[PDB]
Write a protein that binds this DNA or RNA. Sequence first.
RNA 1: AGCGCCGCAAUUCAUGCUGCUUGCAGCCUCUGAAUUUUGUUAAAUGAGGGUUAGUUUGACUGUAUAAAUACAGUCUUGCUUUCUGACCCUGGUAGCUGCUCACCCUGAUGCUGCUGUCAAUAGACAGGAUAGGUGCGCUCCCAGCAAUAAGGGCGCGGAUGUACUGCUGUAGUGGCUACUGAAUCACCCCCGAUCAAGGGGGAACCCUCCAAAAGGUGGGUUGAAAGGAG
Length: 430
Amino acid sequence: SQITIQARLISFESNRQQLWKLMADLNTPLINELLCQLGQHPDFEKWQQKGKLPSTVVSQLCQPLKTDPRFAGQPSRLYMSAIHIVDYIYKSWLASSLPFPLVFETNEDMVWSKNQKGRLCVHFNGLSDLIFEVYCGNRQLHWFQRFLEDQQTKRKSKNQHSSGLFTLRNGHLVWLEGEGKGEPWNLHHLTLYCCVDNRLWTEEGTEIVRQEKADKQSTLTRINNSFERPSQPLYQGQSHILVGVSLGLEKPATVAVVDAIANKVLAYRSIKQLLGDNYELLNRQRRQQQYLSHERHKAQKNFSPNQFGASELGQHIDRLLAKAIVALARTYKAGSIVLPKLGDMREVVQSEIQAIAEQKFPGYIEGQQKYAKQYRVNVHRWSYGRLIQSIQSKAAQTGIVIEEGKQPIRGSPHDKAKELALSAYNLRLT
RNA sequence: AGCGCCGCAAUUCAUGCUGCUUGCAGCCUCUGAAUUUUGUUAAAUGAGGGUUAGUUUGACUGUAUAAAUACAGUCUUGCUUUCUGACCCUGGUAGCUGCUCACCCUGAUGCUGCUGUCAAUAGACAGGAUAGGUGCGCUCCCAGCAAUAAGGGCGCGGAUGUACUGCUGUAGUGGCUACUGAAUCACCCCCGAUCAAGGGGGAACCCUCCAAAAGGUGGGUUGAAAGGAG
């Protein structure tokens, strides 16, 4: 699946300042001016009647800005970066003191080469003089090494390699703000974000992609190419087994590995089981959540800038749950991980508070509402969207599917997980 | 008092265990779920602001496997995050500034709360998280204040006046920028780059050999995990 890999690009002060002048003082002005000229263009409104502006506008407004004196000329790929950035920003709008990123559509825009010291280096097409190396960890090193090897593998074939099978597919070159003062090229740390596809790493995965990619002069000309390709068996997840993930307030995500054929349950993996040594994180996140809503509502107008919202502990917990759920779907050979819909979750939470209140104080409504009010204080709504996103990401990475479900309104959390998995299996026939 | 968490107990169980008839039967050593109970000089959550290009969390190749996986060997690079651990501080001055304030009444997802000494409310040297609630946390409670939610009272110089200000400072409390002191570590320590870069020196535990023991070798562990950037 798609995944973005980071790397710190490193070169000398001369090359860095050259790039800085190109971007911050000769292309960031280009970006801003193209943005206003999009704003100050006579037929601005007529396109909003459709709600989308096609690629025509930037295509015709790209070239008049080549010889504008304040721009001092850019390499062609930097013009492509600018036009793609304005495309991205106006698409994000139609729904700081830091230069706009650089956008590279394909890998051929990046040339890789080993130096005498052995490290990988990357230049960009149309630049050819800046020798930005690549800095990264082992979790990313094999990625860049494989990009270099595929580059070396296309040239030996006299450039008869299809571009899709290449591992690296996109790339973002951005500056990142830091501390200190002085010049900003030696202050903002350049970083390369590489977008790849794991589906195109394992040899079996690579051979999977050829069939649909044909779906016309060179449609099948250079499909077959060996590369260097590790062969690892594709994870063949058998169906008939679903891992429902009941989402709730007190138990945010409890799973039950259901064998739906005989309605037998294979594994009631609770959250204390889905997290292990990471269970201590769960309550911790709530300790932060109850904190934030206390401070966020305190400064009602958001006037006071404080540190609330400090950590991404929710993100880490949520991806930990994703990893554990996919691992526990593998261990029982599950053919899906089942999640409910966030659209059908606003009522689920409130039904849960009401049911817990009734089971704690039966009939005594004036005490039921009291208990519910002090229960909303202590246990807050989970970041369910992050959970669903991270679980879908890990499921795509490993290969298991995510299908829609329908959480039951009442019952035990394990009972809700089991019945949610069964409901998803029932909907699977549809 | 109330509520959420933690797991100490019991009970009932299984998602757990036993040779099966392979789905049933039986019992709670390991792994857990629920209900109730309990808070023990006990188990386990939790406990303030920062700090590493940190270690493990990798990839490939042969074997074993019905396999998650284990071993052997080759390479290795540092990106962004989460814990844990260790460590450092609870900032100094120079500005732009917020936000509120006759005196009152209860009081608000209102504010503050650590030990100790001097000292007088208000706070200075020095310790430092174990920062009020004896299991822990809290929009709950308490102690204090409340001008810094409301909301309702109520006043001296003034107003052409019908509105509004003084009693508002030589305050209380939050932001922004700049110069600044300590950590700049992941077994410990020294030297370096922090657009690059690693190399020394050492202690704790090892597997094994020279022998006969000790001692002296070769290799290895000295916390782990996660990741799609918008």
